[PDB]
Amino acid sequence: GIRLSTMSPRYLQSNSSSHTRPFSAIAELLDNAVDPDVSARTVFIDVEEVKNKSCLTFTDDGCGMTPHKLHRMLSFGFTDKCPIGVFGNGFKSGSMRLGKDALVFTKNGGTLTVGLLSQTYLECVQAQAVIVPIVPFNKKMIDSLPSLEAILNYSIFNRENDLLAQFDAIPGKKGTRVLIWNIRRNKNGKSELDFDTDQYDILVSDELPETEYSLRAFCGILYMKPRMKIFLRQKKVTTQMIAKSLANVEYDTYKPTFTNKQVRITFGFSCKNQFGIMMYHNNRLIKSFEKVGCQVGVGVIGVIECNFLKPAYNKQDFEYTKEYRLTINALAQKLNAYWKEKTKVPDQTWVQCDECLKWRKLPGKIMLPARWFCYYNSHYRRCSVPEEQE
Ligand SMILES: Nc1ncnc2c1ncn2[C@@H]1O[C@H](COP(=O)(O)OP(=O)(O)NP(=O)(O)O)[C@@H](O)[C@H]1O
Ligand SMILES: [Mg+2]
Ligand SMILES: [Zn+2]
């Protein structure tokens, strides 16, 4: 009837500017593997060399997607959503922020579907609109025929057997695998992300917290209570409950002016030197190590989850409202009170079971073990007992 609002392929480049830091795009991808619909048990971040080209790999063993839902994924604004995703843009901004081209393999226990979000493909054919090739799969193919030809002719996978074997890189029968190539290179010529300095870490070519340049430490605190396992370059990331790993822990509260829900704030001391305020939102870290009050008070960390706020388009900050300024003022005042109240090893030690993903409180020390199971506890010794009261 009426002509639709088209979208230029340049928009894929434009949208990539949503994230000012690449760890935020990577966080977008991890947030998509952890949301309750998918609820992946494990995600794998790695760098793989394909066709003499560096590729970022994000492989989760989650629910998987249908060919229809994969198109919805590669489309804008489509989301069936305390999940983290709200916009229906996270992947389209994050993957493009990481590289020019992205492939998404997904299997949901019966269908093998491939999707391509590549600006290189769109610029080679000089398309005027955004074209997204998608192919579903016995492994017999199922509309998808020109998509498969475009993928074989313009992506990094030229042979059909290699394209299908990429599904075997999912550690289960259901899961998703994102593969981003043509990564962002900064002005000095090198790649923005560092793969060679630390074989078990992805760094940034940079006082400044180690979370700002170390992807391992960033993933360690990306979530307020981790439930999903993260493997950075085949090595498990020892995540932590940033609130429970503090010493001399005291508590405070904050009431938003537009509701009657008390929000708990946890104040403590860091055990390894760096510090500030951890502002979360639906378990996701939005603002990290924000100095408030007498910190501009060394070593004190305050944890707060602000579900009464709403993050920005990139989930790196919040909307600048009266509630936000009031929350920061309150945090500064209460942190000053906490530090005034005081004039090592954490008060509690918590470990996540490797097979079980629950957090158990141990009477021990804190770094933390790589693999640990409920069966190894000192009494809660079985993986069938739920978490503690917390
Ligand atoms: N790794 C994944 N595994 C399974 N399903 C996924 C995955 N990534 C995306 N999806 C699905 O595809 C949709 C695309 O989401 P996306 O465009 O990234 O934004 P969103 O997750 O909907 N919310 P937002 O991140 O704020 O934009 C998701 O809502 C899921 O339904
Ligand atoms: Mg998303
Ligand atoms: Zn367990």
Author numbering: 29 to 109, 116 to 171, 175 to 179, 183 to 246, 260 to 326, 329 to 351, 358 to 404, 420 to 442, ...
Question: What did the study's authors say about this model?
Answer:
Microrchidia 4 (MORC4) is a poorly characterized member of the new family of CW-type zinc finger nuclear proteins. Members of the MORC family are characterized by their gyrase, Hsp90, histidine kinase, and MutL (GHKL)-type ATPase domain, which is also present in several chromatin-modifying enzymes. The ATPase domain of MORCs is followed by a CW-type zinc finger and one or more coiled-coil regions. We show that MORC4 is an ATPase with an intrinsic DNA-dependent but histone-independent enzymatic activity.
